[PDB]
Design a protein around this ligand. Structure first.
Ligand SMILES: Nc1ccn([C@@H]2O[C@H](COP(=O)(O)O)[C@@H](O)[C@H]2O)c(=O)n1
Ligand SMILES: [Cl-]
Ligand SMILES: [Mg+2]
Length: 321
């Protein structure tokens, strides 16, 4: 009893526990809704930058309590956010991975270490191979790219579109017009190539609007609105253009050349071609090291079969079946 406490985490939105019934399992603490004061609390938590989340941040500030930034894990589910609960959860008491304006737990892991062991790196190799072999991604919904869709050996590049309102854009040091710059930069650099734009799945299903999807591009540009498996789609390109999408890291995991126009969580470590700078990120990292911290250590996994705390391999085995 000396090594544990009964001090719960405060939240200011009932929507968190609604969308994540196993929230307390992820947090390893109890949750309480709208506490009137800090006494008895071990932290406050919020989801993204919605109104209620910013109120939680303010209370953390007021009360001098840690603020836990909660997000869906990098491996989330078989289905989009509105289809099922998340299979892993990111819980960041420092900042949040997509916010390049401050440190985050993930950035701290990458900068200063404390975790690189032969045993962990072996696990990372195993998990990375399984994800590549089984074409696993965040949502695991898309269909395969049929043979004949792409012309063999034809030069082509891929631009990744995102959802309007994505906080990772502006907190990744970019803005709405960065997507237009990314497009014309790709044109100028690849005069002989075909240009493909992949619309975000949430925009395909009509729940959100996109940046590039709303633009009027040259008729020769091929805008993809079919719901292809993203890692299957990526296999048909060598060079990827992205502002701040997680799909850029999925491309990096497949060894593609990733040109970043924002500063996402995986940029600034020496593995990407960066149009932005982040002086706070100093240590160079290999892909395996970046993957180990970002996918194995940083998220909190549940064993989908038991509802109890687990690891990345529990979710992988669940996604395969
Ligand atoms: N244009 C896009 C952007 C993202 N995605 C998928 O959605 C996930 C989340 O991407 P965002 O970071 O852009 O929301 C990606 O890791 C990828 O699996 C996609 O399939 N097509
Ligand atoms: Cl919230
Ligand atoms: Mg998203």
């Amino acid at each position: 009893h000396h090594h544990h406490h009964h001090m719960p985490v405060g939240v200011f939105s009932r929507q968190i526990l609604k969308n994540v019934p196993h929230l307390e399992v992820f947090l390893e603490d109890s949750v309480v809704y709208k506490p009137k004061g800090p006494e008895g609390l071990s932290a406050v938590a919020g989801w993204g930058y919605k109104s209620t989340a910013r109120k939680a941040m303010q209370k953390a500030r007021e009360w001098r309590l840690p603020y836990l930034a909660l997000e869906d894990g990098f491996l989330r589910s078989v289905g989009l956010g509105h289809e099922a609960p998340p299979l892993s959860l990111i819980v960041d008491p420092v900042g949040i991975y997509y916010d390049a304006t401050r440190p985050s737990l993930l950035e701290n892991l990458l900068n200063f270490g404390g975790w690189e062991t032969p045993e962990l790196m072996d696990q990372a190799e195993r998990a990375l191979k399984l994800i590549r072999d089984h074409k696993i991604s965040k949502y695991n919904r898309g269909k395969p790219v049929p043979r004949g869709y792409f012309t063999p050996y034809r030069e082509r590049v891929l631009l990744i579109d995102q959802t309007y309102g994505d906080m990772s854009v502006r907190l990744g040091l970019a803005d709405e017009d960065t997507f237009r710059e990314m497009y014309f930069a790709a044109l100028e650099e690849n005069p002989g190539a075909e240009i493909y734009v992949k619309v975000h799945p949430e925009v395909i299903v009509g729940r959100k609007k996109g940046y590039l999807a709303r633009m009027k591009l040259h008729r020769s540009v091929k805008v993809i609105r079919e719901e292809f498996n993203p890692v299957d789609l990526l296999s048909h390109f060598d060079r990827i253009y992205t502002v701040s999408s997680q799909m850029g890291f999925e491309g990096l995991m497949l060894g593609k050349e990733v040109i970043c126009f924002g500063m996402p969580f995986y940029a600034g470590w020496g593995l990407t071609r960066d149009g932005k700078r982040c002086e706070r990120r100093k240590r160079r990292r290999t892909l395996l090291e970046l993957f180990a911290a970002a996918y194995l250590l940083y998220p909190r996994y549940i064993n989908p079969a038991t509802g109890k705390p687990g690891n990345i391999f529990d979710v992988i085995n669940h996604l395969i079946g």
